Amino acid sequence: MRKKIFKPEELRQALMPTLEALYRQDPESLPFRQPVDPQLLGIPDYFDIVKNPMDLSTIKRKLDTGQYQEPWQYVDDVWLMFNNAWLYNRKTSRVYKFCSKLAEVFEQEIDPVMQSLG
Numbered sequence: 455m456r457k458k459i460f461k462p463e464e465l466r467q468a469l470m471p472t473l474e475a476l477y478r479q480d481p482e483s484l485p486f487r488q489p490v491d492p493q494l495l496g497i498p499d500y501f502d503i504v505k506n507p508m509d510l511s512t513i514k515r516k517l518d519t520g521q522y523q524e525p526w527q528y529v530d531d532v533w534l535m536f537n538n539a540w541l542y543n544r545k546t547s548r549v550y551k552f553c554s555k556l557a558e559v560f561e562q563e564i565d566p567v568m569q570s571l572g
């Protein structure tokens with residue numbers, strides 16, 4: 455029942471510790487702390503494959519400015535971030551590996567938090 459509105463302060467307080475847990479993963483979170491810059495990274499085809507880019511800093515901004523109205527929107531952006539990376543990077547690459555590790559941390563952290571919000 456996702457059209458029920460939550461208060462931005464309450465969403466921030468419950469969901470931000472799960473975002474901080476991702477940021478704490480070093481070096482696994484390093485590829486995800488800023489938007490993908492295809493020029494910087496030498497991958498000019500990135501925006502051809504990844505139509506809706508997402509990363510930790512954008513999620514964090516949306517959380518800090520109250521842009522999520524309900525918590526699955528946050529969960530959606532997190533998985534969008536991980537899906538983009540699993541889609542774009544080769545299964546044998548370091549980034550793919552970091553993505554799988556970071557997604558594992560997120561699954562652990564998010565479940566009791568979402569349980570306590572529903």
Ligand SMILES: CCOc1ccc(C(C)=O)cc1-c1cc(NC(=O)c2ccco2)cc(-c2c(C)noc2C)c1
Nearest residue numbers: 481484485486488490491494495538539542543548549
């Ligand atoms: C071509 C491989 O790069 C990527 C390809 C795809 C994606 C995604 C998320 O789909 C990410 C990266 C990526 C990005 C960054 N950091 C920055 O882009 C950045 C840092 C500061 C400013 O920009 C570091 C690394 C990285 C690390 C760590 N150790 O080895 C490598 C390599 C990898």
